[PDB]
Every structure is written in structure tokens, then in C-alpha cells.
Write a protein that binds this ligand. Sequence first.
Ligand code: FES
Lengths: 58, 122, 23, 72, 74, 86, 137, 48, 97
Amino acid sequence: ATPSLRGRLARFGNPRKPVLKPNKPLILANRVGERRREKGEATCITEMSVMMACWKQN
Amino acid sequence: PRYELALILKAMQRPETAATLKRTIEALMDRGAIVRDLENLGERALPYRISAHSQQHNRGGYFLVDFYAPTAAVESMVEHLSRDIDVIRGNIVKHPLTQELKECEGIVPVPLAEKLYSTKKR
Amino acid sequence: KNVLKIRRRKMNHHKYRKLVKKT
Amino acid sequence: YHEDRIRAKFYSVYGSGQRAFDLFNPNFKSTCQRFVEKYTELQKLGETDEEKLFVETGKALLAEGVILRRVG
Amino acid sequence: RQFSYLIENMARDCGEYAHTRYFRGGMLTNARLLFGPTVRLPDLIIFLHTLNNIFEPHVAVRDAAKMNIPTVGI
Amino acid sequence: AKHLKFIARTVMVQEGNVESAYRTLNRILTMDGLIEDIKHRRYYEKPCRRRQRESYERCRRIYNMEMARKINFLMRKNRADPWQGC
Amino acid sequence: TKFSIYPPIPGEESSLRWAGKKFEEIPIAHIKASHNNTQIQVVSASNEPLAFASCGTEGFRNAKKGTGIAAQTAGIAAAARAKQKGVIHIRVVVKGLGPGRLSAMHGLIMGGLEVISITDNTPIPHXGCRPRKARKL
Amino acid sequence: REVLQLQEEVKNFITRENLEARVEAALDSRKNYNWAITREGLVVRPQR
Amino acid sequence: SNEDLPISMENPYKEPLKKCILCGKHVDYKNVQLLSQFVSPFTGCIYGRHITGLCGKKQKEITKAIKRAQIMGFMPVTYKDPAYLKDPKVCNIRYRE
RNA sequence: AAACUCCAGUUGACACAAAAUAGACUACGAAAGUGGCUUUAACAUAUCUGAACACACAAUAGCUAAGACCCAAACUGGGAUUAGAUACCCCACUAUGCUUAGCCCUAAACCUCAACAGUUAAAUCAACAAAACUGCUCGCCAGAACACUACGAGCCACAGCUUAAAACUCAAAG
Ligand code: FES
């Protein structure tokens, strides 16, 4: 669906307390977020440990 | 008013369950209860291990006591079941059939809320 | 809104409490 | 329009027939309005009952030769 | 854009004019600078579509009013 | 726990595919909220902070679900331009 | 037949045997993946200790214990000791979201054991003891 | 009509006379409250 | 005036109002089978209404009945009773896809 | 690092502590506040407004006894960092958070937007914020700063709270 927005913000008609307190108006922007690059992680740590273990034995 | 006693017993043999059930039904009567019916839900395995009266229980017989009693009889019967060592767990609730379910009209999907912000150019 | 007017009362109150403690 | 009640009922009982609407022809009549016309014409006689009238209309349109499915 | 060719043809056939393209700012309010000091502006503007391609009033509707040019509009 | 063991949060390994099992386990825990709850339960989140975070996440879901609905609604119009040139 | 991801119900009859032993009878590998350490203890189906290994027991110290490579060696060390006592198939019960949660499992299979099931047992209070205050970082 | 309906039910209430009798009879029955439902809203009751 | 003008009616094409599967059915804490349908097989977590597809009334009733059935020794808490892992799936949740 | 090593890891037994999921719900209460289960009792007013000479309440923190002790924790002590570090980081532990019986009466107690009755018509409309308004009533305000201050008075409050100025100073403050 989308969660309701009826009687959720502090407005004059609204008798109850605000449920939501948005920092920025809940209004769609005309852009979308930039694709964030995936953080890198060390690679081939398993194969490295296999190699480093043989070194210690030999 | 009408109540229900959700009675988990100690998975005993017929003489002992019959003995235990008779105790409970009399103790209700002794406190002014009009016992309406007794139901056997069967001996199941407990959803989880219940420790009661210095024993670890894994199975138990499930029973229901439909009865009418004065409102003051509830506290007294609750305390009575505390001291019965053949009851694994006993809870008294308002009878679920006393409440009449209101007719429902249907799910009405929520329209998107409007006029939350002024129509000014930001 | 900034808190420049709270900060004046903040220091006033702090100094006053320290003054009462000293005396 | 009052005919809309009849259209709704026909769509609920029988639904949109295999007949494909031709919205280009300004005088196109669908099996629905065909059904409606019969219903409306039989009402001119003086029948004030829907149950009896509907059973008649459904079979009076079958006398003309129609493809209907009452269960779905 | 579905009818830009039709409207451009129709304008040529009746010996009149068409602007079915991106409307550059100031064509009407700044015509003596965009065309030349002696240019003659339209005496009538026919809008066959009054909304631009973001579903808002075409800028020329307002600019025609500023220049005191009557407009016809669908 | 008083409950039975090897029933909750338990996934069977198929054909020794450990990586795929642990992956499905992770999904279950995440899809039910357990992962995020454990992380937030490391330090005490004060009631004022919890309410500020729940409001932020709920304002976020609305916006995210409304943008996703507008993207999905307009996806049909990404097709090739039919009046190319005019 | 459809492979079931749900573990065999103990009471119900089952055909799944891995070394002639029923699901109930397969030893268990308990993995404690802490933020700073990983501990692996293999027990028999009757709760008899068979092998234990942690990142500290393998020589890693201080922050080096809180790594995947340190958690993996502990899995290999535990597997070596568990195979000496006759362990082949193990049920895995992981507890915590530390760095060596999956690396320890890698060390176990890399050490020759065969995982038949994965179970998570991270403690989640329902509501319980108040955790420590937030860090000002 | 309520009092009428109520008057009929009281004939089967557990009194001290029909106590052991009713306890033995209850120990032989097994009332089930378990029924499942489907995506179309149809009660599926376990057959025995 | 004229008879061909729109008649002030109510919408005859209005569809029947969607009711939830549990509409009109008594939810009971003793009916663990029904209650189990609405919890996670793996964690025993209660599903939200966006998964169960329930209305406000019946989500609350199911929620309240589960919390009662659990503490009264009828329904397990940390998982779904293995006896009910074959009940009709009614929840809009997929763990494999 | 210090710390622990009567310590960790499976398993069993075991709260006077706190209440995952549900909750994408938006309900109850005068506000404060209220989200584990059960039961009992129970959520004022058939016009409205209205007590800063009154009453009854009022988060957190504190105070007075008397208990409880899992965890969290001002203070404090160690470890670390640093030019110093009376902090931020680590460990430990206390008041305190809980119960009971009395106090204390304060919060950015703010959704900084009063109650009641209405209107989206006009000219909406300084800016921003949560669009502009009408009737009616009460409560509040009238440059900044001195000042959540001093005096006086009341208060179970004695480093308290509530009421609350002036002189000198400024040409701004906002
Ligand atoms: S739609 Fe009727 S109970 Fe939910």
C-alpha cells in the first residue's frame, strides 16, 4: 500500500499529538539518489591463510 | 458473570485427573460458582517447559471450566489454584462467547493525505 | 532559531548557582 | 442514467460478453444495451417486479439468439 | 509533439505561422532584440495546446497577455 | 530457553552448500527484524532517541514507497521516443 | 522429494541419516562470535565436550582476535581435535554477530567437518537488562 | 426469548448431583478449538 | 424540464467492500492453529498487517490472542509449532525469493 | 593497557529488574503520561467561557525513612589519551533508577500554535513555519541588558520553588 499520512503531522485541524516529525517536507523530489559505490573489502584472505600456513609448516 | 478456567493439569492417570478435576469444580462451587460445563482439550505436550511446584513439566492435560461466579470469586479461586500442586497452570478469563462480534463492513483503502503543505513554490 | 538567548540565561544561572554555593 | 443499474446487474450476473465493443461506430449497440433495451421495453407494459422481469428478459433475449453465461 | 507536423503543415497551407517547437525565452517580450527593431508581432495567437510538456501553461499564454495580443485556445 | 532446541532460526544445509544456507538464514533474521534489533540493542537507545529514530524511519518508508511507486508508474514511458525529430 | 529447510521434527519418524545417526544424534558445534573474539566448542549429542578452540587459544591477541582470519584458524583447530574424537557431521549453533561468525564455519568445513544444519541462537531480550550507555565517538 | 433460551440450558449445567458423572463423561470427550483458514476465507477443520 | 438529464443516483457499479479473510470469524486464544498461521516459522514473530493482510480489528484480535495463548501455555513463543508448518499459507511473505 | 583468571564454553535449576515481534497500527488520558498476560473497579458535565485571592494533579532528577539487587549508572578510584584531560575512550564500583510511606512541584512540562462556534469566500498571503480567516471569552505581552536576579511574601521546600523590581549602561537587541 504506503503507510497512512492522515492525522500524523502537527496541523491545526489535527487534535491529537503528532505521530511523525519530519525534518523535511514529505514531498517527492524530482531527482533520485545517486548510486553509492559499494565499500571494498580485502580479498583472497582464505587463499592467503592457506599459503601462509604451509610456509609455517615448511 | 461468565468466566472460563483454562486449566492445565499434571498429565496424571484417570483416578488422579478425575480427583483433581473434582477438587477444582467443587472449589468453584464453594466460592459461589455455577459451573456450566467441563471440556477436555486432551493431553498435549507443553509448548515449553513449565516449572510448577518444584517440578519440571513437559506434558499436561488441558481442560476448560465454563462457569458463572460473582466478581469477588475470581480472586479467591485464583489463589486457590496457586496451592494445588496438580495444576501446572490455571488462568481465569472472561468467557470469549460472552462478547458479541460487531459486524464488519470491510477494509477501506486509505487515500493519500492532502493539503499537508501550502501550495507555494519552494 | 539559534540558542544565543538561551546561552545567556545558561551562564547567568550557572554563575548564580556557583555563587550561592560559595556563600 | 437509470439504465446504469441494469447494466451493472447484467455485468454482475453475466459479465462482459465475448462481443468486442466497437467504439468507432456511433450507432454501435452492445449485447449489454441489447439486454437493457429488452428490459426497458418490458417495463413499459407495467411490470413492477424485478425478479419476474429479469427471468423473462434473460429468456426473451435468448429467444432472439444470444450467448449468455449465468454462472460466470 | 504528436501533432507538430500537422500544425506546421496547416499553418503553411493557410499562409500563416506556427511555433510548435521549444519556445525560447523572450520571443514576444523581447522580439525587437531577438528579430530586429522593425519586426511585426502576431496580431492573434491560436493555442491548440495550452500546456507545455510538463503539464503547465505554455509561457506564451502569459507573454501574449503581456504584449496585448489576443489569444484563442483549446 | 524453556523451548525445544534446533527448531527456531534453524536452516538445513543442502548438498553441503553452507554458503547458501547461511545466506538464507541471514535473510530470515533480517526479514523478521532480528539483525537490526540486535545491533540497536548493543547500546541503550534512550526513549527520546528511539522515538526520533522510529519517526525518521517511518517518514523514510513513506517517501521511499512513494518514490518507488512513482518510478514504477512511469517506467512504461522510458520506451523509445515516437516523435523523434519534432 | 522436496528438500525441506525445516529441521527434522524429533518425535516424527524420519529417513534422513547422515552417518546412520538421526538428526538428534549428530554432534553440535557451538560458535560464539563476539566483537573481539570467537569461541568454538564441539559437543556430542549428549552434551559431552569433544573439542574447544578460540582465537585466543590459537595465539592471536588483542584486536587481532577480532578478525575473520583468526576466527577461521580456530575453526580449523577445533576441526582437527573434533575429527580425532570421531566427529564428521556437525550441527552448527551460532551465537552473536561478531566478525568471525561465518569465518569460523569456514574453518570447520576447511578442517574436514560436514555441516548439516545452521541454527542461530543470538540472545534477543524481549524487552530484559538495560544495555550499557552509548559511546560518544 | 433470552430467559426462555436460558431456562433450557440450565437443565444441563453441572450440579453436585451430576458431578462425578460429568467428570467421567468429560474425560472421554475431546473438544477441539483448532481450525485453519485459507486465502479465500474458508475454514479448514482437521478431519479427526 | 427534460427527462434525458443525469439522474442523481448512487454508483450502481460500486464493488462489494473488501473484507479480510477473518471477517466474521471468532478469533480464540485456544485456536493455536489459526494463530500459528500468522507468526514466523523461524522466530515466532507476529507478522504485521502488511503481510497478514488483516484489518485493524482482526490484527489486534490475533495479536492479543497470541500474547494470551503464549503465556497461558498454549502457543510457543520462539518458533511456530512444528505441527502447523503445513497449514494453508495466508501471509504475503517469502524467505526464498 | 589496566581488569578478570572461584574465569570462560555447552547443559540444568533459578527475579522484588525490564517489557522483541505485533506497531507500515495512531488508540486512551486533563496534562504529565500510557504499548507482556489475567481479573476486579473505572474513564466528570444534555449550552459555552471562566479561579496568579482556591482546590486536585504534574516527566526526569532530588529529599525522608524501610526494603529489594539482574543490569545500567552521577560521584570516586584505577587504565589510556593529552602540553594539561578535574573530559571524550576502557574497567570497576556507589548514590540513583525499583517497591512501600511521605515530601519536593520543576522541564525545549514545546505540537513554543488557548477554549468554544464557524468559513474557504475574498483582497490568499512581509519572510520562514504547519494556508488565510470570522465571531466570542479568558490568560498573557509592550526596546536590549541588568534579571529564572535583589528585596518583600508564601510554601513540609533552608544551596529550594512561586511571585518579582530598581540604579548604573546601551543605540541597538531581536
Ligand atoms: S473486514 Fe470485517 S473483520 Fe476485517
